[PDB]
Design a protein around this nucleic acid. Structure first.
Length: 98
DNA sequence: ACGACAGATAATTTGTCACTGTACACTACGCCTTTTGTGGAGATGTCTAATATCTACGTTTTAACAGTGGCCTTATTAAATGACTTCTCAACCTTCAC
């Protein structure tokens, strides 16, 4: 909702639209669930989905730096997620529907 | 009889795929307590050499004067002066002169 982004809206020509309730966001809410499950849960510093599920070893053996976590996340997107099938088309990857 | 040949047959697991329950909805390493060894003043206590003071130690110097020691010749006679001492301090009578 910032001024700065609205300045970008004017300068690049997109219109900012607000989400009504969180569910309408699901196209971006859900990929956090997808990416948590398929990536972060496998990495040493995993922290669980909630305080009530927080695994106590997370701060005992956190071992990545962000110059590695970037590479992990970028590889996951570009070599897998881009080529993954779009869940309700089936005909083509996520990349080819773009 | 039982059980013993090769093969039937009711399981057992392997693999498909329509279905659904769920998280994504950002929202723990952070709030609070206690101990604790290290550290900064800052009042207070510690305790000396030393440069005197502060008389005395007594020790020199003076002059005053006291005592020792040397020298100093001694006689006679005269004079002047001053003194001392001693002695003395009669009295009636006779005779011849105017």
């Amino acid at each position: 909702r910032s001024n700065h982004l609205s300045q970008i809206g004017a300068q690049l020509g997109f219109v900012c639209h607000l989400r009504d309730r969180p569910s309408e966001g699901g196209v971006v809410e859900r990929p956090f669930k997808t990416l948590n499950d398929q990536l972060f849960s496998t990495l040493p510093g995993y922290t669980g989905s909630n305080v009530q599920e927080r695994p106590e070893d997370a701060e005992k053996d956190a071992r990545l730096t962000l110059r590695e976590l970037e590479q992990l996340l970028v590889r996951y997107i570009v070599d897998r997620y881009n080529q993954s099938i779009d869940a309700r088309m089936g005909d083509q990857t996520r990349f080819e529907r773009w």
